[PDB]
Amino acid sequence: TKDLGIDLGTANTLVYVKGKGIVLREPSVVAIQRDTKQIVAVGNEAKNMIGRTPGNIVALRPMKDGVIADYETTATMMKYYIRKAIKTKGLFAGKPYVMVCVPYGITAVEERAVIDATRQAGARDAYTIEEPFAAAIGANLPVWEPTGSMVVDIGGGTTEVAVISLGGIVTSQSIRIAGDEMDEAIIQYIRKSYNLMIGERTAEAIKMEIGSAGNPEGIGNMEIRGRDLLTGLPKTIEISAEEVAEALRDTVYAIVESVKNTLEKTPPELAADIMDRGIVLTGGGALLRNLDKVISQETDMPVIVAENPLDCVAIGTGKALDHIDLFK
Numbered sequence: 001t002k003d004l005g006i007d008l009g010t011a012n013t014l015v016y017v018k019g020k021g022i023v024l025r026e027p028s029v030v031a032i033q034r035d036t037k038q039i040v041a042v043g044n045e046a047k048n049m050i051g052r053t054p055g056n057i058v059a060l061r062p063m064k065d066g067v068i069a070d071y072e073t074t075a076t077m078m079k080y081y082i083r084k085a086i087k088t089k090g091l092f093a094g095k096p097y098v099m100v101c102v103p104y105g106i107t108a109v110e111e112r113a114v115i116d117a118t119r120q121a122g123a124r125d126a127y128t129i130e131e132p133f134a135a136a137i138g139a140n141l142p143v144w145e146p147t148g149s150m151v152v153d154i155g156g157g158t159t160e161v162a163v164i165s166l167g168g169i170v171t172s173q174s175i176r177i178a179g180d181e182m183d184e185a186i187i188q189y190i191r192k193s194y195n196l197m198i199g200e201r202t203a204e205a206i207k208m209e210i211g212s213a214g215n216p217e218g219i220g221n222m223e224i225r226g227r228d229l230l231t232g233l234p235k236t237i238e239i240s241a242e243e244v245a246e247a248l249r250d251t252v253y254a255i256v257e258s259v260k261n262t263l264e265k266t267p268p269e270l271a272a273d274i275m276d277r278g279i280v281l282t283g284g285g286a287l288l289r290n291l292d293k294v295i296s297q298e299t300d301m302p303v304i305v306a307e308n309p310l311d312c313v314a315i316g317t318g319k320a321l322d323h324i325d326l327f328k
């Protein structure tokens with residue numbers, strides 16, 4: 001019987017097996033029959049279904065923009081990801097134990113729902129770890145010592161800020177402001193400034209290539225193709241990093257404010273530890289050009305992007321399987 005940690009992200013799902021490490025990296029996507037709502041495929045299998053299936057099948061991210069997925073969706077996705085990860089040719093394989101990463105502050109009712117869905121999906125039993133703690137373990141922070149640590153996980157739908165000390169979360173804030181809203185800010189900006197409509201792929205490409213959080217000087221320029229909203233015809237334009245930084249500015253400073261505010265609620269001595277140690281960013285949204293510089297300047301604090309920021313949460317969920325009792 002294997003032991004799994006699962007990060008069912010708003011954009012990316014990762015499964016970690018004790019002993020092996022991360023074995024699965026697939027988008028958090030479902031293929032749904034538009035009229036019956038039936039989920040017909042998950043993950044990569046959902047991707048393999050679209051364009052190849054007669055019915056009105058649609059690929060959707062159930063947690064886009066940090067929306068909480070309902071019970072049935074959660075249990076259907078979990079069942080796919082659990083089955084795919086423990087796929088070994090053999091016998092005498094018991095139902096796995098599963099650590100599920102969850103948001104900070106989940107109500108006891110919601111937590112029971114996650115556990116129930118995860119057992120329903122095939123787990124012998126399921127446990128939870130709060131995401132900022134998973135993230136801090138995966139970023140090699142000293143979560144068990146008395147010193148203050150700070151982590152900021154920016155994903156697709158959610159940013160989570162947490163000061164950690166002595167094996168617990170001391171102060172924490174979660175906002176639905178992250179990679180999806182950054183993409184939407186770019187789409188809206190081009191829509192108002194150029195009466196042009198671009199899709200999510202293009203907004204993502206724009207954000208990765210010339211997106212930036214602070215001074216955009218020297219980042220350059222991009223040619224992008226979209227649809228003219230007056231004529232309906234494809235149309236190509238030129239956008240500057242200055243424009244993109246301007247489009248992102250309010251999203252960035254919502255994130256910066258969450259960091260500042262959390263620090264301002266934290267016990268002063270844990271803050272001074274953080275000032276010495278530094279803030280660690282995790283999640284794919286931490287890769288936004290110069291976000292680490294901006295947060296450092298607005299807090300007068302060191303800021304480091306953790307190595308492999310897209311895996312920290314999943315690694316931390318995996319290492320929690322070494323001391324399961326501490327999460328029961």
Ligand SMILES: Nc1ncnc2c1ncn2[C@@H]1O[C@H](COP(=O)(O)OP(=O)(O)OP(=O)(O)O)[C@@H](O)[C@H]1O
Nearest residue numbers: 009010011012155156157179180283284285287288
């Ligand atoms: N180079 C980059 N610059 C900016 N954003 C990036 C970059 N690479 C990836 N991202 C963003 O990171 C996000 C995905 O990160 P991640 O997988 O950590 O999110 P998530 O699935 O919501 O995670 P979780 O729910 O576990 O916190 C996407 O919004 C993506 O656009």
